[PDB]
Amino acid sequence: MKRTWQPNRRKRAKTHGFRARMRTPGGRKVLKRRRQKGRWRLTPAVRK
Amino acid sequence: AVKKFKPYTPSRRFMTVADFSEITKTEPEKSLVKPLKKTGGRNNQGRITVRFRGGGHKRLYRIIDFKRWDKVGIPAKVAAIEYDPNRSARIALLHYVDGEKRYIIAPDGLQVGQQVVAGPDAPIQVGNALPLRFIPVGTVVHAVELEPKKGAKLARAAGTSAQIQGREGDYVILRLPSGELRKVHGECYATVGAVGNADHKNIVLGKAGRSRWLGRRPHVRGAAMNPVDHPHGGGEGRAPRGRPPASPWGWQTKGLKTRKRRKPSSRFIIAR
RNA sequence: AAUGCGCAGAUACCGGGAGGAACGCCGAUGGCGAAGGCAGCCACCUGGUCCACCCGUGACGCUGAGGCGCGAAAGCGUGGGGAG
RNA sequence: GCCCGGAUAGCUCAGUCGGUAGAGCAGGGGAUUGAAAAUCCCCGUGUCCUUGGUUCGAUUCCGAGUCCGGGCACCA
RNA sequence: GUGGUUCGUGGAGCCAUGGGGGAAUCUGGGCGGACCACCGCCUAAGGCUAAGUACUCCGGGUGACCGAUAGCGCACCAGUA
RNA sequence: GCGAGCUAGCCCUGGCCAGGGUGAAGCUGGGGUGAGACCCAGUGGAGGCCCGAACCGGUGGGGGAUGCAAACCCCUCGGAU
RNA sequence: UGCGAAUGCCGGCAUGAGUAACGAUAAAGAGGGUGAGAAUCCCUCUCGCCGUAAGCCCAAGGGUUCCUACGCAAUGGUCGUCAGCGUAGGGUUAGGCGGGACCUAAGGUGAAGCCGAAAGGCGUAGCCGAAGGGCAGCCGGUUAAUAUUCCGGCCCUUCCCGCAGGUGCGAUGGGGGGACGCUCUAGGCUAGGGGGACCGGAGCCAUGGACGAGCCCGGCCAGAAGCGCAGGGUGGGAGGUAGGCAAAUCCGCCUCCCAACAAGCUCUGCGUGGUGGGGAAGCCCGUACGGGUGACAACCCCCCGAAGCCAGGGAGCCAAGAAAAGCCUCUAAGCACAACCUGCGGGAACCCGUACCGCAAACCGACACAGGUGGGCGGGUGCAAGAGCACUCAGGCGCGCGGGAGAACCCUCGCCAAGGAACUCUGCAAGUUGGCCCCGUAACUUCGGGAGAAGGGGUGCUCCCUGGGGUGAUGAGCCCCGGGGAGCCGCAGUGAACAGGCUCUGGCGACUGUUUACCAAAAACACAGCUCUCUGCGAACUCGUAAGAGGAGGUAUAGGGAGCGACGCUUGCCCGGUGCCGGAAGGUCAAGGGGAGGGGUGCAAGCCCCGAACCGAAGCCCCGGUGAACGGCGGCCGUAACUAUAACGGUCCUAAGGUAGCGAAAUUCCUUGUCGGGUAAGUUCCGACCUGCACGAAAAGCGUAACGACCGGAGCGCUGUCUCGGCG
RNA sequence: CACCUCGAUGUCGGCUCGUCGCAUCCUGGGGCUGAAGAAGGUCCCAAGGGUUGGGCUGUUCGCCCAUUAAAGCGGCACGCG
Ligand SMILES: [K+]
Ligand SMILES: [K+]
Ligand SMILES: [K+]
Ligand SMILES: [K+]
Ligand SMILES: [K+]
Ligand SMILES: [K+]
Ligand SMILES: [K+]
Ligand SMILES: [K+]
Ligand SMILES: [K+]
Ligand SMILES: [K+]
Ligand SMILES: [K+]
Ligand SMILES: [K+]
Ligand SMILES: [K+]
Ligand SMILES: [K+]
Ligand SMILES: [K+]
Ligand SMILES: [K+]
Ligand SMILES: [K+]
Ligand SMILES: [K+]
Ligand SMILES: [K+]
Ligand SMILES: [K+]
Ligand SMILES: [K+]
Ligand SMILES: [K+]
Ligand SMILES: [K+]
Ligand SMILES: [K+]
Ligand SMILES: [K+]
Ligand SMILES: [K+]
Ligand SMILES: [K+]
Ligand SMILES: [K+]
Ligand SMILES: [K+]
Ligand SMILES: [K+]
Ligand SMILES: [K+]
Ligand SMILES: [K+]
Ligand SMILES: [K+]
Ligand SMILES: [K+]
Ligand SMILES: [K+]
Ligand SMILES: [K+]
Ligand SMILES: [K+]
Ligand SMILES: [K+]
Ligand SMILES: [K+]
Ligand SMILES: [K+]
Ligand SMILES: [K+]
Ligand SMILES: [K+]
Ligand SMILES: [Mg+2]
Ligand SMILES: [Mg+2]
Ligand SMILES: [Mg+2]
Ligand SMILES: [Mg+2]
Ligand SMILES: [Mg+2]
Ligand SMILES: [Mg+2]
Ligand SMILES: [Mg+2]
Ligand SMILES: [Mg+2]
Ligand SMILES: [Mg+2]
Ligand SMILES: [Mg+2]
Ligand SMILES: [Mg+2]
Ligand SMILES: [Mg+2]
Ligand SMILES: [Mg+2]
Ligand SMILES: [Mg+2]
Ligand SMILES: [Mg+2]
Ligand SMILES: [Mg+2]
Ligand SMILES: [Mg+2]
Ligand SMILES: [Mg+2]
Ligand SMILES: [Mg+2]
Ligand SMILES: [Mg+2]
Ligand SMILES: [Mg+2]
Ligand SMILES: [Mg+2]
Ligand SMILES: [Mg+2]
Ligand SMILES: [Mg+2]
Ligand SMILES: [Mg+2]
Ligand SMILES: [Mg+2]
Ligand SMILES: [Mg+2]
Ligand SMILES: [Mg+2]
Ligand SMILES: [Mg+2]
Ligand SMILES: [Mg+2]
Ligand SMILES: [Mg+2]
Ligand SMILES: [Mg+2]
Ligand SMILES: [Mg+2]
Ligand SMILES: [Mg+2]
Ligand SMILES: [Mg+2]
Ligand SMILES: [Mg+2]
Ligand SMILES: [Mg+2]
Ligand SMILES: [Mg+2]
Ligand SMILES: [Mg+2]
Ligand SMILES: [Mg+2]
Ligand SMILES: [Mg+2]
Ligand SMILES: [Mg+2]
Ligand SMILES: [Mg+2]
Ligand SMILES: [Mg+2]
Ligand SMILES: [Mg+2]
Ligand SMILES: [Mg+2]
Ligand SMILES: [Mg+2]
Ligand SMILES: [Mg+2]
Ligand SMILES: [Mg+2]
Ligand SMILES: [Mg+2]
Ligand SMILES: [Mg+2]
Ligand SMILES: [Mg+2]
Ligand SMILES: [Mg+2]
Ligand SMILES: [Mg+2]
Ligand SMILES: [Mg+2]
Ligand SMILES: [Mg+2]
Ligand SMILES: [Mg+2]
Ligand SMILES: [Mg+2]
Ligand SMILES: [Mg+2]
Ligand SMILES: [Mg+2]
Ligand SMILES: [Mg+2]
Ligand SMILES: [Mg+2]
Ligand SMILES: [Mg+2]
Ligand SMILES: [Mg+2]
Ligand SMILES: [Mg+2]
Ligand SMILES: [Mg+2]
Ligand SMILES: [Mg+2]
Ligand SMILES: [Mg+2]
Ligand SMILES: [Mg+2]
Ligand SMILES: [Mg+2]
Ligand SMILES: [Mg+2]
Ligand SMILES: [Mg+2]
Ligand SMILES: [Mg+2]
Ligand SMILES: [Mg+2]
Ligand SMILES: [Mg+2]
Ligand SMILES: [Mg+2]
Ligand SMILES: [Mg+2]
Ligand SMILES: [Mg+2]
Ligand SMILES: [Mg+2]
Ligand SMILES: [Mg+2]
Ligand SMILES: [Mg+2]
Ligand SMILES: [Mg+2]
Ligand SMILES: [Mg+2]
Ligand SMILES: [Mg+2]
Ligand SMILES: [Mg+2]
Ligand SMILES: [Mg+2]
Ligand SMILES: [Mg+2]
Ligand SMILES: [Mg+2]
Ligand SMILES: [Mg+2]
Ligand SMILES: [Mg+2]
Ligand SMILES: [Mg+2]
Ligand SMILES: [Mg+2]
Ligand SMILES: [Mg+2]
Ligand SMILES: [Mg+2]
Ligand SMILES: [Mg+2]
Ligand SMILES: [Mg+2]
Ligand SMILES: [Mg+2]
Ligand SMILES: [Mg+2]
Ligand SMILES: [Mg+2]
Ligand SMILES: [Mg+2]
Ligand SMILES: [Mg+2]
Ligand SMILES: [Mg+2]
Ligand SMILES: [Mg+2]
Ligand SMILES: [Mg+2]
Ligand SMILES: [Mg+2]
Ligand SMILES: [Mg+2]
Ligand SMILES: [Mg+2]
Ligand SMILES: [Mg+2]
Ligand SMILES: [Mg+2]
Ligand SMILES: [Mg+2]
Ligand SMILES: [Mg+2]
Ligand SMILES: [Mg+2]
Ligand SMILES: [Mg+2]
Ligand SMILES: [Mg+2]
Ligand SMILES: [Mg+2]
Ligand SMILES: [Mg+2]
Ligand SMILES: [Mg+2]
Ligand SMILES: [Mg+2]
Ligand SMILES: [Mg+2]
Ligand SMILES: [Mg+2]
Ligand SMILES: [Mg+2]
Ligand SMILES: [Mg+2]
Ligand SMILES: [Mg+2]
Ligand SMILES: [Mg+2]
Ligand SMILES: [Mg+2]
Ligand SMILES: [Mg+2]
Ligand SMILES: [Mg+2]
Ligand SMILES: [Mg+2]
Ligand SMILES: [Mg+2]
Ligand SMILES: [Mg+2]
Ligand SMILES: [Mg+2]
Ligand SMILES: [Mg+2]
């Protein structure tokens, strides 16, 4: 049937994108945590 | 006049559509239409604040004139009467002599061609707007300002009408479509006559779909829900109210009065 | 008599206001209409009838099964109104 | 089967602080009537359900019993 | 009407302050646990001020600390696959 | 703090619905009458109308049950301006 | 610091076991080649399957999977020489296609401004934002792999700078326009398709016949100007002018004129058209596939014909159908040795995408997963039509384990003597019936229905006759709808495939709809409609601390809340308790006010504590009202001239003691109540009776045509459900 | 009653398949009879085999219809998911 992953490259960057994070104080803390942990990518890998 | 149908389908038995005879123009005055944002009952948070609203035909707002003094003593000819999907009443398109075209809410009787005018002057004739203090007692009148220069806010629904009952200093005694008696300032304007399209109240929607076309989604009784949702929710089968009948927010809904008692306008009201 | 209303200010009296229905006297055992029926007053639209005159038509009449129209009160539908 | 209530004049019923118990109707005797009613005057019988016990004394207080009424018999 | 203090309304002061009221300039004011009297101690409603104190991303020195299932999640291109 | 890329509602803007049936109003003509109501034809082409694919569903049954499948398959069935 | 257990944790290896599986029952066979090795790779032939797809083209997603060369350890449900796999090399070309140096939509953001302990929330303009608006490229060839991108032919657009000719030029401002629904639809075309006796073409004569107007293949595509043929848009002038937030000569409005179902201007579509390309079968080529030839290929006529185009076309209807720019016009500053407009020339024209898969082995589902995924094309014949069904073209595929065998048993399927629901909870299942035409059709009904009711008859082919249309011309040809009469063959003519079993009678719900994604589709929810109630507008109500927003750019014929649920006839009594409503009095009542009077200390002046009357709101009390407000709606004894029963009486209690109508009911315990009906036989069903354990009127009462994948009962038809099994 | 089983001993009837008991429903053998015969009544021996098809209800049971030699009663986790 219709599963839960319906990929949409705009959706991804609009929702979890770097500029998306940077607006909400909650999301800047996501980046803070992700860098402090040393993630290779703070934001989901996307392709325009 | 109101159209009925033969029962060539169920719900056509009782369906009843308005009589569009007094309608003169189909497409509206292009310079006088704005788009209207359809809310679906949601406020500026994305939340519903009025239930069971949405869908229904796309509509185009007709920008209409409820302050008639901004053209004092300039007369106009009644050019058309057209459908307005945004009110119960029908609107009249009038051409002022100086070239401005405006939409007026069309009174009962008025028809294409007649002169119309607003101002303290103004003969007392259906269509003319005047300050109340110069409108003779016992005249039925509609589109009434409640406070001067704040715009007409009283009696604008189909076949509605206020009536002047007497005078008191700066105020005049009005009987509203709700039978309440209120004092309104004499400087408040009012076009004379009643609203018309007065058979609005006899159209019989007929089927569920017709309610949807007006943007009215289905409306579910509290009795049909569960206690989490409504004060009336739950029980086993059916169940009576089991308590003073209430709204989803738990306040009493039979008789319980809600007008703020301390309201300043209390001083100018005298009925029910 | 009691129910009822009344010092939470009633009845009775004065003034202001709202609203509906019916029209005293005239008025009559009177008038009109085919019947049911019709009553304050004003205007408009309109029916029958009577008389005067002896002018016109020339029996074009009378009645009338069916059909069609009207039909007090009460009653029924949709809206309005609601004082007694 | 398990709990609550009641039983008083012929009928339907009040009542009690433990001592002499009443109401209405019915019924009886008189009156009024030509004669019946309706009306007026006058009249209760009650072993206050059975049985035990507390009492000086028990319809009244107590414990059981017959009877009636009511509610219950759930997860299963 | 409340907070802070050991102080939970308690005999409840002191410090702070949202509301109201509302002074004085040394013979003035605040405090010594309701209050009053005496006897004392301080000088509100302006501000600055090192050191001695805390921590460990980092550097070093040590270990009756581990020794690849232990030791940091990672001794190895791990916050990776 | 992260989530309406599944799902529920709503908002904006686009798109889809083979082919058949039925034959409302309105016309127009004829009748009818003092005038009408109304009646009959022909035209017309209305409807949460009918049959039926796409499309949307999920009625009964069989199968499947470490499945092809963490909801599938087959027959059958509902809606389809 | 000692392990045997904690369905302990990590890891390793067993058992089941050479067991179940190897992923759609669309299907295979042979020959040649290659290689160490071949059912599995290449090639030929034969066979089968899809063909409104299982073929082709877009979009999203994926991200080198594309092409080539060399490979086979692993991945591949087997094998593998093959691959979507390993190594390497190559491959994606744009002024016109998509998107950006354009526009705005919901929404986001957001100068000003408002709000919030902080973080932040709101917010007119502005900005951002697209499968909407705007905008200039079609067709062939070429590559192993890109092409509307390279090449070729023909054709456009914008910027800049020049000439030439025009004109008061000139905005982010004014106006026009863009610009809009649903259903039905005229005419004229185009796509697309069929036919041809005509034009062209290799070839063929088989097996009994046929050298024939024989069979087989094909007969086009793009195309500026100018020309036609359709259609769409649009009136032309002059005066007045207070409106379009300045100004307008423009728009609007008024008054004159001429014009008027047109014309004329435009604007699109279509045809023609310079030129430019293509160009089958078959045959020979060695390609996995393309080439050569066929060829100087022909390139015409007729017919069918869109749902597409002319398009802002037309009619009707109600539920009343975006914005902004480009564009035209107008004027403001400013400038008019500028500028703009019109042609013609030369120059200038950037960024990103472009490979491949794309109904699937490359996307979403852990898998090369029988699932899921939007737009366009989707040929032919026949079947009434059609995107339906059967076959089939182009194209693509045989589903990545095979070989045998011929038990039980299982799945999917076919048939069955006699019987025909006896099966069973139940006709569950399967059968039967099935299209079109014509005849015919009851109760009841809200007059529309019920209806496809029911029940029948017809259906193929041959020859003769024959009526209409459309196109041509009124004529032939080609289509389309038919009508009459003779006859032929079979068991059977909708000869295959697709295609209702029917009636009667109850319950419930009026109805089409909606729901427990994934055990419930229903009598549940919704629904038009009815009633109650609130709400005068800065409305009531909802969200939010607030600003603010929805309500609503609405205004009592409106909006919120509650119940009831088309419609018909109706909806009784109780206001004592609870709730709501109304009560300017009374009682009580908190802070506050007020301080009679008491008290602590002081030598006192004082300072400081309590504190009685009395004045004090809402609320409660109290007095009323109120039933489509929460809710409630009795008992016992007696009595009629046969019994029986009780219209009648007596009496206790209550706020009042259940009216109509219905009633063993989706309610009835006793219960399989009793009676009637159906059946041979009926714990069900239908009709009644009333003793209603424990119906009753908007948690509505009693009915009701039509509707129902709802639930019950009966019958006809037909059957492997069954007697009761059998064969395949 | 609460002894095994609550880190699970699936619970009524039907269907299929049976098997055993005998306290025998039929058939077989017998005693007594208030047994003439025929048909019964009641007790004894006997478990080899037999013990029907339908209406109703989920029913077991039961009641009916039509028969029969007869339409037996029980047990096996109220035998057997
Ligand atoms: K509802
Ligand atoms: K309920
Ligand atoms: K009244
Ligand atoms: K009493
Ligand atoms: K007595
Ligand atoms: K303290
Ligand atoms: K202080
Ligand atoms: K101190
Ligand atoms: K001190
Ligand atoms: K410091
Ligand atoms: K290790
Ligand atoms: K680790
Ligand atoms: K139609
Ligand atoms: K272990
Ligand atoms: K093994
Ligand atoms: K391999
Ligand atoms: K596999
Ligand atoms: K766009
Ligand atoms: K402009
Ligand atoms: K042309
Ligand atoms: K490309
Ligand atoms: K097929
Ligand atoms: K075998
Ligand atoms: K049976
Ligand atoms: K012809
Ligand atoms: K059918
Ligand atoms: K009903
Ligand atoms: K359904
Ligand atoms: K539901
Ligand atoms: K609004
Ligand atoms: K009451
Ligand atoms: K009361
Ligand atoms: K009350
Ligand atoms: K005080
Ligand atoms: K009954
Ligand atoms: K009941
Ligand atoms: K019988
Ligand atoms: K019977
Ligand atoms: K149904
Ligand atoms: K257990
Ligand atoms: K035996
Ligand atoms: K089972
Ligand atoms: Mg997942
Ligand atoms: Mg890095
Ligand atoms: Mg506009
Ligand atoms: Mg519920
Ligand atoms: Mg919730
Ligand atoms: Mg609640
Ligand atoms: Mg409730
Ligand atoms: Mg529940
Ligand atoms: Mg209930
Ligand atoms: Mg009100
Ligand atoms: Mg007269
Ligand atoms: Mg004469
Ligand atoms: Mg009458
Ligand atoms: Mg009357
Ligand atoms: Mg009545
Ligand atoms: Mg009336
Ligand atoms: Mg009325
Ligand atoms: Mg007694
Ligand atoms: Mg005694
Ligand atoms: Mg504290
Ligand atoms: Mg305490
Ligand atoms: Mg001290
Ligand atoms: Mg060591
Ligand atoms: Mg480690
Ligand atoms: Mg490690
Ligand atoms: Mg979503
Ligand atoms: Mg969504
Ligand atoms: Mg339909
Ligand atoms: Mg259908
Ligand atoms: Mg059907
Ligand atoms: Mg399609
Ligand atoms: Mg779907
Ligand atoms: Mg199914
Ligand atoms: Mg279907
Ligand atoms: Mg171990
Ligand atoms: Mg290891
Ligand atoms: Mg390892
Ligand atoms: Mg085995
Ligand atoms: Mg085996
Ligand atoms: Mg096997
Ligand atoms: Mg396979
Ligand atoms: Mg081979
Ligand atoms: Mg082979
Ligand atoms: Mg394919
Ligand atoms: Mg992937
Ligand atoms: Mg490849
Ligand atoms: Mg190779
Ligand atoms: Mg392998
Ligand atoms: Mg490949
Ligand atoms: Mg490769
Ligand atoms: Mg630039
Ligand atoms: Mg914001
Ligand atoms: Mg913009
Ligand atoms: Mg576009
Ligand atoms: Mg090409
Ligand atoms: Mg390619
Ligand atoms: Mg090309
Ligand atoms: Mg100009
Ligand atoms: Mg063409
Ligand atoms: Mg053609
Ligand atoms: Mg064709
Ligand atoms: Mg030749
Ligand atoms: Mg031969
Ligand atoms: Mg020849
Ligand atoms: Mg020849
Ligand atoms: Mg062509
Ligand atoms: Mg003009
Ligand atoms: Mg101006
Ligand atoms: Mg024209
Ligand atoms: Mg052309
Ligand atoms: Mg050649
Ligand atoms: Mg149009
Ligand atoms: Mg703009
Ligand atoms: Mg040029
Ligand atoms: Mg491509
Ligand atoms: Mg592929
Ligand atoms: Mg492919
Ligand atoms: Mg492809
Ligand atoms: Mg597709
Ligand atoms: Mg594929
Ligand atoms: Mg494919
Ligand atoms: Mg996949
Ligand atoms: Mg596969
Ligand atoms: Mg697949
Ligand atoms: Mg096709
Ligand atoms: Mg065809
Ligand atoms: Mg067909
Ligand atoms: Mg098909
Ligand atoms: Mg082929
Ligand atoms: Mg397949
Ligand atoms: Mg048979
Ligand atoms: Mg047979
Ligand atoms: Mg038969
Ligand atoms: Mg049976
Ligand atoms: Mg069936
Ligand atoms: Mg069938
Ligand atoms: Mg009948
Ligand atoms: Mg009919
Ligand atoms: Mg009919
Ligand atoms: Mg034949
Ligand atoms: Mg069929
Ligand atoms: Mg029943
Ligand atoms: Mg329904
Ligand atoms: Mg239907
Ligand atoms: Mg479900
Ligand atoms: Mg669903
Ligand atoms: Mg299910
Ligand atoms: Mg279901
Ligand atoms: Mg607002
Ligand atoms: Mg309901
Ligand atoms: Mg004081
Ligand atoms: Mg008070
Ligand atoms: Mg009261
Ligand atoms: Mg009631
Ligand atoms: Mg009820
Ligand atoms: Mg009720
Ligand atoms: Mg109901
Ligand atoms: Mg009923
Ligand atoms: Mg019915
Ligand atoms: Mg339905
Ligand atoms: Mg069988
Ligand atoms: Mg077999
Ligand atoms: Mg135990
Ligand atoms: Mg165990
Ligand atoms: Mg024995
Ligand atoms: Mg035995
Ligand atoms: Mg036996
Ligand atoms: Mg049965
Ligand atoms: Mg039997
Ligand atoms: Mg037992
Ligand atoms: Mg037992
Ligand atoms: Mg058992």
CSV table of N, CA and C in Angstrom, one decimal, chain A residues 4 10 15-17 19-20 27 29 33 35 44 47:
chain,number,residue,atom,x,y,z
A,4,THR,N,4.8,5.3,4.4
A,4,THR,CA,4.9,6.6,5.1
A,4,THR,C,6.0,7.5,4.5
A,10,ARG,N,11.8,19.3,-2.1
A,10,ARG,CA,11.5,20.6,-1.5
A,10,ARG,C,11.1,20.4,-0.1
A,15,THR,N,11.5,21.7,5.5
A,15,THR,CA,11.2,21.2,6.8
A,15,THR,C,12.4,21.1,7.8
A,16,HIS,N,13.3,20.2,7.4
A,16,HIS,CA,14.5,20.0,8.2
A,16,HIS,C,15.8,20.8,7.7
A,17,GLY,N,15.6,21.7,6.8
A,17,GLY,CA,16.8,22.4,6.2
A,17,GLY,C,17.5,23.3,7.2
A,19,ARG,N,18.4,26.5,6.9
A,19,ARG,CA,17.7,27.8,7.1
A,19,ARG,C,16.5,27.6,8.0
A,20,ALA,N,15.8,26.4,7.8
A,20,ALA,CA,14.7,26.1,8.6
A,20,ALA,C,15.1,26.0,10.1
A,27,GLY,N,15.4,25.0,16.9
A,27,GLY,CA,16.2,24.4,15.9
A,27,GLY,C,17.7,24.8,15.9
A,29,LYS,N,19.2,25.0,18.6
A,29,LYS,CA,19.8,24.1,19.6
A,29,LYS,C,20.0,22.7,19.0
A,33,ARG,N,23.6,21.1,19.4
A,33,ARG,CA,23.8,19.7,19.8
A,33,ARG,C,24.5,18.9,18.7
A,35,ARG,N,26.5,19.7,16.3
A,35,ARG,CA,27.9,20.1,16.2
A,35,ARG,C,28.7,19.6,17.4
A,44,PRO,N,19.8,17.3,7.1
A,44,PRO,CA,19.6,16.2,6.2
A,44,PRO,C,20.2,16.6,4.9
A,47,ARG,N,19.3,17.8,-2.2
A,47,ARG,CA,19.8,18.0,-3.5
A,47,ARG,C,18.7,18.8,-4.3
